[PDB]
Symmetry: D2
Subunit: 354 residues, 4 copies
């Protein structure tokens, strides 16, 4: 007994991760590979397989099919890593046609009735679907995952905000190329260079972190999220996968790095308690060596490769300020892997039927 | 009429910048190219010319000579970019033999009688040379320049600390390979990877910044330096030259990013006043665009290429925090250029004879 | 008596070399920077200065103007490095307005009345302008330079072909990114990868070499060009400038590599003879070290930087086969520099204004 | 029924492949991880895992042990990828103590009594062992595998030489960084550069190819190997795994690239006929796309990832010349996978008993 998934944009840098991971999944099958430009061609002939291994045997000869909900009677779930602008209306059209829709796209991320989900952090937000359906009058639904960059920060910051009076986080990112898609970043922009991404990208990263944090169930009540200073300075360099982030985190009062570090080691959420198939044992992995994590060596760490955010370099700066770094696999936990985990949580909660 | 310079480690990545720059200098000539390994060989035959243009024609034919005082009777100034551990005692040997020694090495940077010198920040600390001479019973002297990474931070921070109640700066660095020398960083460390340098390197960057800031003559007296919180998280990636740094800067009172930027634009010190030949018209260049500076494009910027720290992205974070970035050409301003500027100051103040 | 020149696609990777070089030129001035997208704006504000130094002081505040042959009264020369498909009809408009056009684009390279010019190899071919003017009934004219990759092989092969019974050349190229222009090659195509350009690219390289070789005045007449076997296998990697090529060259009879070496060393042409300003003293520089030439260190070689093809590794393979490598600066000698050289030749022979 | 393996230099770039591969092998166990500088420590804590996936769970905890025959009583096979100069005497010490040693080092590659083994091309030359043992008066033996670079040309070239009148091959290599080990190639040698490896490396590549070809059993007799002309021009670039080569192959008589293509597509040797576990189904994979193979996308191709040489771009140059490209995974087929395959062969022919 399995569920049949369609993956929109299946030849893309995110769609390849849905293909790789769903090919190994116990009950979600990659059964319908949707596109536009290469409709009618075999997947393995057209795809850039910029990930680990090779195109799965059983997928390689599948023809890419039209992005058309009228052709998808047989499909149980839509995964939608589509580009911004194009995504919004396609996802509405699928939802209106009665599909569950898991989007990795930005278009719906701040709809107050659409869940911006990190399953370990705000699983309770899925019950927004009730109101979504009723107010939007459709049988289906849309759920979004956040910007991968925002997730590499929000996961550690969420674990901390939960239990500590955190009052700011000032972040520097060093992001990989695959985040921008293909053709994406011109090679001349990152050879012997660093490409700042600009105020617009900095501002959207912070916006998304604020939404995720505004939804975390905390054990302390100070400070109020509105009194939290977040800031980001974002860049891309010539790494293929893996977003590397340096966070300076401030607290309203005296807070020991050793305590925070232990909170990070100990972090887990509903996905781990439920033993969901794509839930890592340790959604945050903490490293103790002063030159770790490194992008190359740590982006595929953990019992489920790519699904863990890897943290290190925990250090006291002064009594109210600590330094840490974090690494997220941007197309796995940051996108496809997070979206598959969303789907398992939604099946588990009753929102997608068996 | 000419002053004759020896360049120790002349073939090295800093040594080459001495040669390129002094080749164009109105009164300090590269008269003696010293080494060890390639003593006896033509310079241009052996040097790795990893900088702009080609080996100066009047220099290529010059043979590499021993690093030995008794051989250097005609020499007026020693520039010493020698590796740590080796440098300390060689520098002392030269100073003892009557030479002015301008070192880019770490060994003497914390000696209480030795200038750790950024001409635009603490030009007055050259007066330490007078007590150094009495203390150590020698007619020469040692002056050091700071770690290039420290200069990238300390230059814009020194400008701010001078005029503002700055109580913290929290730094992320993305440093180039030339800084590590040759063979330096293994290729496998930086292809598809980011290399963290570790706690010792972070700590040493901070300690050097503290020494530099403690010597700035400030126009406000608050807060005390002992009350200032610094932190650095340092990395290398595959860029050839140019250290890029993101600085989150806190103040003890409300502070306008607009004012701080004006302060950086208008920044100048003694070298510009005295019109030293290597003094750039703008020791700090401020950029307005939200994707500048960039390493490749801005590392050779300004009227003296590579002598200016290029700053950008000035933004208000909250009322007491600002974000900026800076780029420093690590072997020009960050080492050889700073050294040559040091030498021009020392000549102008009578420390090195005409 | 300064000639004023218009630069089409002035913001581009090749246009920047016209802007750099003509800024230092003794009688050809860059007086009209033509674009489309950025027309009106200052050159310095928009241009991506992906070359040595900085935008020239006196060019930076020049406005980008529209590309239209009715707005250029002040103008004496057109330099056109425009993309294929676009460039063919544009350049015709300019010659059909009176202007002399030196083109770096592919469109007219195979017109039997359009010179396809390497000034050291086939300078006499400029007389095709006479019967080109006649048969097209227009007052101006078009001259084109060859694909950079083809120049990197044909300059040494032409010097060889003129004096030796060469029957074959079998080429592997390893080309830089700048040749694809901007946005050009996506970053994901060349990070930890080699990108083959394909059969169409291999075939167009060979076709151009063949045209050029057919136009070389020889001292031998064996074999005939029609029996010469040429092959290329072309790639790009993550280098910014410099196309590196490995050539296995065969001969119809016993031929010594030391003789061919001397021929390449001694190679001069009409540009040298006339002492044209942009003519290098050594159009082919021959290196003797078995690890040279190297892209990084040799692409800017020579008295006129980037104007010389640098050759090395001359080795006997068997009695009738030799191996050599060559490095060409693809935007300088391979485009803008060759073009400026074409402009100087044509003035000399009285085809251009004054 | 298992054979216990000792992996010398286990933490090296070739060691980690022995560990990775053997960890999944049906009958060879990686039982003893030998080293020097990290003896006493757990493998997982010190190893640089610069390959696919992560350190196998059951290997991670294993302690690195001394390289000492006296400690290895229970070991059945020694795999030795030790650096040149060290390897020779150590491998002789192991064979004189009674062990079968399969070496990836160059030291013994040209001993008359030491097989230089590509299992698909010259499996019979294992019989050399008998006179090795007689002559050397030792109960163990040494077998070597060739230079990875030589295997990338020798595998397709042997398959051609076996069936066609091949009289020359003229090769250009574009090799990865991992072949030079760690720290190996300094990062500054390869950023925005190509590093030629020189005459000694070119000559040794060809010498190894000649030896291997002289031991291939042919179906045709012309020409004699002594009259075949080989040349190599070798380079390194900033790729991690995978050596890419372009080969121009010539023949003494007319030979159609379509036929040579069919021969390569159909290539198989004794390891396939013996169904050895590590024998890929297709020791040569032939691709049809004019932009394939590519390093990143194909170095891990095949039913056994990295065990197949991938060939592409088969094209007629003239009646007597073709062009093809080949890609080898240099640490799998080119080193550890090739060694394991030799060991299986030696087990199958009774030289190593289970």
């Amino acid at each position: 007994r399995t569920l049949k998934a369609a993956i929109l944009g299946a030849t893309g840098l995110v769609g390849i991760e849905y293909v790789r991971m769903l090919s190994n999944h116990p009950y979600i099958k990659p059964a319908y590979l949707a596109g536009k430009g290469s409709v009618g061609k075999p997947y393995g002939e057209v795809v850039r397989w910029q990930t680990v291994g090779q195109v799965p045997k059983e997928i390689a000869d599948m023809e890419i099919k039209p992005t058309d909900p009228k052709l998808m009677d047989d499909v149980d779930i839509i995964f939608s890593p589509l580009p911004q602008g194009a995504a919004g209306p396609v996802e509405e059209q699928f939802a209106k046609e009665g599909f569950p829709v898991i989007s990795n796209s930005p278009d719906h991320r701040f709809d107050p009735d659409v869940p911006l989900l990190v399953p370990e952090l705000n699983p309770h937000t899925i019950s927004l679907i009730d109101e979504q359906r009723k107010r939007r009058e459709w049988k289906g639904f849309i759920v979004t995952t956040p910007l991968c960059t925002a997730q590499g920060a929000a996961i550690p910051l969420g674990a901390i905000f939960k239990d500590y009076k955190m009052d700011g986080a000032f972040i520097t990112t060093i992001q990989s190329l695959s985040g921008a898609g293909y053709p994406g970043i011109p090679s001349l922009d990152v050879v012997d260079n660093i490409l700042p991404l600009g105020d617009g990208y900095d501002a959207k990263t912070i916006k998304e972190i604020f939404r995720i944090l505004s939804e975390v169930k905390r054990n302390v009540d100070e400070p109020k999220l509105e009194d939290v200073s977040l800031a980001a300075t974002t860049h891309r360099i010539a790494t293929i996968h893996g977003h590397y982030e340096v966070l300076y985190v401030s607290f309203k009062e005296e807070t020991a790095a050793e305590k925070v570090k232990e909170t990070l080691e100990n972090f887990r959420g509903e996905p781990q308690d439920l033993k969901l198939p794509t839930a890592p044992s340790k959604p945050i992995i903490v490293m103790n060596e002063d030159t770790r994590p490194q992008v190359y060596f740590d982006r595929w760490a953990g019992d489920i490769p790519g699904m863990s955010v890897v943290v290190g370099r925990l250090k006291q700066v002064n009594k109210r300020m600590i330094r840490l770094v974090s690494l997220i696999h941007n197309t796995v936990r940051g996108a496809a892997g997070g979206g598959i985990l969303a789907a398992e949580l939604l099946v588990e909660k009753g929102y997608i039927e068996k």
